Design a protein around this ligand. Structure first.
Ligand code: CYC
Length: 142
């Protein structure tokens, strides 16, 4: 399953030509953590870093359990909807755009793409494609 999640993020990174693709998993204590990552070598491996424990709030569990994709073209646009607690994070890791799709069975996790070199207008077919990839991960888990 660890090799399957690695294969998936690597293939999704190549398909989107994203700077990073990762899978973020919600743990039974209500914390969240990156568990698989493919990143272009000009950027850090987030999995190699020693992050403090991170609460994944009930607000976002209840949102993402509903299944909908969130495309954020420009994380610095004050109307684009980046969570306020992530403002310092996107600055420190030079994340400019992100694409988030929930992995649901009950939220298991999120498939997330980053653009780092530019803002990125994600287009409708890419949001549908990530929904299909999230469905493929859920089917694999079953
Ligand atoms: C604010 C709402 C709370 C919160 C929620 C949250 N976090 C993510 C996703 C990621 N968080 C990552 C890692 C860390 N590690 C830290 O120490 C830290 C604080 C500086 C963070 C943010 C991480 C690698 C991810 C996945 C990749 C990504 O870019 O998202 C999410 C889901 C994404 C989204 O934008 O909705 C949420 C809701 N984090 C907090 O610390 C608050 C308690």
């Amino acid at each position: 399953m660890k090799e399957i999640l690695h294969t998936t993020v690597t293939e999704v990174q190549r398909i989107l030509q994203a700077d990073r693709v990762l899978i973020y998993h919600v743990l039974p204590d209500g914390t969240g953590k990156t568990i698989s990552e493919s990143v272009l070598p000009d950027y850090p491996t987030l999995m190699d870093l020693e992050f403090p424990q991170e609460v994944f709030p009930q607000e976002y569990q209840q949102l993402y359990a509903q299944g909908r994709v969130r495309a954020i073209a420009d994380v610095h646009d004050p109307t684009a909807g980046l969570a306020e607690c992530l403002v310092e994070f996107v600055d420190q890791f030079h994340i400019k755009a992100k694409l988030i799709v929930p992995i649901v069975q009950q939220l298991w996790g999120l498939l997330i793409a980053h653009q780092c070199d530019s803002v990125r207008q994600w287009v409708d077919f890419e949001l549908e494609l990530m929904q299909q990839l999230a469905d493929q991960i859920s089917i694999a888990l079953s």
